[PDB]
Design a protein around this ligand. Sequence first.
Ligand SMILES: NC(=O)C1=CN([C@@H]2O[C@H](COP(=O)(O)OP(=O)(O)OC[C@H]3O[C@@H](n4cnc5c(N)ncnc54)[C@H](O)[C@@H]3O)[C@@H](O)[C@H]2O)C=CC1
Ligand SMILES: Cc1cc2nc3c(=O)[nH]c(=O)nc-3n(C[C@H](O)[C@H](O)[C@H](O)COP(=O)(O)O)c2cc1C
Ligand code: SF4
Ligand code: SF4
Ligand code: SF4
Ligand code: SF4
Ligand code: FES
Ligand code: FES
Ligand SMILES: [Mg+2]
Lengths: 217, 43, 230, 433, 59
Amino acid sequence: GAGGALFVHRDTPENNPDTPFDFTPENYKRIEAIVKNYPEGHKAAAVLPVLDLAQRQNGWLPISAMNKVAEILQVPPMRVYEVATFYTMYNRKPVGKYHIQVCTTTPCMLRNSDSILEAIQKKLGIKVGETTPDKLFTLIEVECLGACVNAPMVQINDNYYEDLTPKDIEEIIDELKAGKIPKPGPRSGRFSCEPAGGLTSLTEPPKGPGFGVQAGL
Amino acid sequence: FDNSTYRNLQHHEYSTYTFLDLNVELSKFRMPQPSSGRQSPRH
Amino acid sequence: SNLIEVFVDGQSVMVEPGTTVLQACEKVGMQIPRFCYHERLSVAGNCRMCLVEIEKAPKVVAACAMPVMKGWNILTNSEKSKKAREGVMEFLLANHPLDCPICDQGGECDLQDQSMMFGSDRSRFLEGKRAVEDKNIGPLVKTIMTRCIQCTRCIRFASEIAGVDDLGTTGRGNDMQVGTYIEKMFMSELSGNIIDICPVGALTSKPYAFTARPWETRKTESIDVMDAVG
Amino acid sequence: APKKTSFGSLKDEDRIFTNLYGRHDWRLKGAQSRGDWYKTKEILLKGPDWILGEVKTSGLRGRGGAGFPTGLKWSFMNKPSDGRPKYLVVNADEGEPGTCKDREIIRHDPHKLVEGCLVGGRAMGARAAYIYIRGEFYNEASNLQVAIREAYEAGLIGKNACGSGYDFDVFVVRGAGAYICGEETALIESIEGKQGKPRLKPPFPADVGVFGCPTTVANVETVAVSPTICRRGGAWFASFGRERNSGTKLFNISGHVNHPCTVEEEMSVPLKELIEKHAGGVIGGWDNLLAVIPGGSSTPLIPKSVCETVLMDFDALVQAQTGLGTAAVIVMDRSTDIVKAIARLIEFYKHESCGQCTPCREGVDWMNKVMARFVKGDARPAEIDSLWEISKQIEGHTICALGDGAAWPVQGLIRHFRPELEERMQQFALQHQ
Amino acid sequence: RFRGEHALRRYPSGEERCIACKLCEAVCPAQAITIEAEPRADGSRRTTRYDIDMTKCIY
Ligand SMILES: NC(=O)C1=CN([C@@H]2O[C@H](COP(=O)(O)OP(=O)(O)OC[C@H]3O[C@@H](n4cnc5c(N)ncnc54)[C@H](O)[C@@H]3O)[C@@H](O)[C@H]2O)C=CC1
Ligand SMILES: Cc1cc2nc3c(=O)[nH]c(=O)nc-3n(C[C@H](O)[C@H](O)[C@H](O)COP(=O)(O)O)c2cc1C
Ligand code: SF4
Ligand code: SF4
Ligand code: SF4
Ligand code: SF4
Ligand code: FES
Ligand code: FES
Ligand SMILES: [Mg+2]
């Protein structure tokens, strides 16, 4: 329904302009590499990646991180605030160590996405917006993630876990708690976007180079 | 010849900075960028 | 010479290249309704109040941004133009607060006047209305952002005329809000002008608040003496 | 014999994306053994006119969803240089629900995309290619970067790009979770460090695009098929599908089907044949089918009466009042709540609106509230025509086509399933009084 | 419906109902109403002058 997240900023002892943030030297090298991609005179184009890089170092985006990005790129801070509040992958609040994002759009909802949602809720004891007290997990619902064929699917810190069943998501959560990482991809003996059984197409050996080249080439 | 094996397992080893590391490595082969003649639109 | 001939309601007029549909209509003395277009600001094209029908064209164009083409016939009073204006007015009034008696913009509201001249006379909206929290941008400009229609005139004025980049939009969708995103004071020697360009009571004068209505004021045209610009 | 009539059975020898399922090596060596990066120097030396002519005679239409003729749109940038650089932008956002083709192309056939970038840039006279990939597709983006790295090392791109004499760069830029950024102008704005808000047109990207420079925006599927079309010829690609609907197409069949998947197929395959052969049919049999959305959430749905005899091309689906879209089939059996599905789609559009213009920003939220009430049955029958008029007011009155894609599903639901709506209202009134 | 002597009313809380919109002053055919307003000490929009000339009023 409603977003729930606020789009104004009020200073807090844990998030103020004086909150310590600064890029590591390796992150500065990466910033130089990012900036060099765009034409000179248009450095502001680096706002989107560099900001993300900040989130990749700190975990979320405090107001001081946005100020640092604005100062580095010589862009007015309100532009960086606009970018941070527009795009949904930017975390303007601290999240858990594992950000669980389950898709609930119609193609995923048709293949029983609600079952995955309730299984996660009952395994973790948290709702669709909260963080576990251990600060290891944060569960939210998201729109289509581009893996509709593999519904139901979830995303955890740049990993897709697809073809989910309640037991499957429970075991993935158990593996993530125990200090291991789970293998991404389909979880039903598919490991592809292929038909679940039979491989109706793409069975012949691939043709070699120059098989169908036209005359005069 | 085998068509029953999934070889796309490299991304199982991709870390947080893999994309940016690849960008840093690729920065070497790039052609020099064009310029508009200004340091910024506010210059 | 380089002038091209266009038609407004079948009436011929010669215009310069790059002239928009709105300016061509203005040449024959017709004023297209507007909320986001200001002739001294950059073109935005977001309010969508200026949509007009071009003859033999199935899609209405934004007159404030679309340049005229040679031989075009602008139909400013066709059924398509009127229905476009009515739909846009309805969407603008869907979430607007019932604040007219307490709004300082009461008798001077472009939203009110264009609702009476080009919109419908009834509401078929049966839901609750959105409400946003107010911002504090200083002691000169009173801010009531529920009245905002998101025309971004203040942002363009601050960025281009005043030379300040303190105003912007945060969020997106129905939840997009005009402000500073932080407790910041929009102080500049030209700040109060954002009260004038804002078509609604979203930005008002704080010293002037509640004191008078526009119909009872007597206008005297005079000169300023606070500096040597006159 | 020309003018075929029963399309939809093409063999593996005529599939462009031979590694769609990722059963082979995705790296450069596998692609080279699969025919990629073959005679690229000769195609580059043929000149932009020859490539544009091949694309024009190929009959290729935009695979992003709009179906604009690719040859003319790419020829729009055939102007002499004015001092500004020229850029090709590849649309890899893939934000449409039900659509997963570009993800598979990027993750399993990235060198196809890189070679398509090079060929399209040469045809357009472009200086470099920016691939705007989805932010959530981190692993796909990293695979694409590895492919670009090993293409740079092999000398297949970069300085002289070949034994050719043409300098071309390929950059990958990641978005941050915004469906609206799939729109070409919104994508261009998002590349330039702004909010992903679409621009008004005119100007078109061919005149003023990224960084204010001439630009051509093409989706990943359209760009990828370019080198194969150039090598095999336009006439070979035109030999598939009906007239003005040439070539092959990737279809993502998902929803209430036995084996949801994605598959390459001839353009004009009938929907029933595609669903029953590749996807394994509808759960509960074909008579259990209730509705199908053929081209992603932006296309109006059609009932079982129409799906049994409709061809899966642009004009055929336009004649059925829905449209081909992204060729993303979403199937729903007689066991689903159709009003709830449409309401969920409208909620998706409400959450994806950028809020720039009044019709989308206000009316999509209004439609979301009205549809949420329709799902329960709180409303009255007189509100169905009101919702139709609201959708008509949104459609055609926005800057961007997100308003159209939010309005069309509601229109389809009202057109084909009005009795279900009225019955739901009647039940709610009966049990509430 | 009888029209007699004028009165200014309150809400049940004891707060005045008048917000000083000046619609009654604008509609008065005899110009019998005079209104002056300012923000109250708590920021409320209230009148500081509300006069009705009953020898001007046509009731
Ligand atoms: N692949 C995906 O994930 C998604 C696809 N879509 C599809 O996008 C479609 C609508 O997209 P639009 O770009 O708004 O359609 P459009 O017809 O307005 O434009 C399509 C392309 O053709 C170009 N073009 C059109 N007319 C031109 C002209 N006169 N001169 C030069 N260039 C011209 C445009 O620059 C544009 O790139 C929808 O039908 C939808 O199905 C929508 C959402 C997601
Ligand atoms: C809201 C919206 C989102 C879109 N998202 C995408 C997308 O994610 N990928 C894509 O290829 N096209 C998308 N499109 C269509 C683009 O306009 C299209 O990619 C562009 O016009 C060029 O595509 P083409 O090469 O198929 O002609 C979207 C359009 C709209 C209106
Ligand atoms: S902004 Fe205009 S319409 Fe809205 S309350 Fe004020 S006077 Fe009335
Ligand atoms: S505050 Fe006024 S000027 Fe600024 S965007 Fe809102 S309506 Fe426009
Ligand atoms: S239609 Fe919606 S998404 Fe498109 S520009 Fe308008 S408000 Fe933004
Ligand atoms: S000013 Fe007159 S019309 Fe307005 S609230 Fe007060 S008494 Fe009523
Ligand atoms: S609907 Fe879930 S991935 Fe698209
Ligand atoms: S005046 Fe043209 S869209 Fe606002
Ligand atoms: Mg005002």
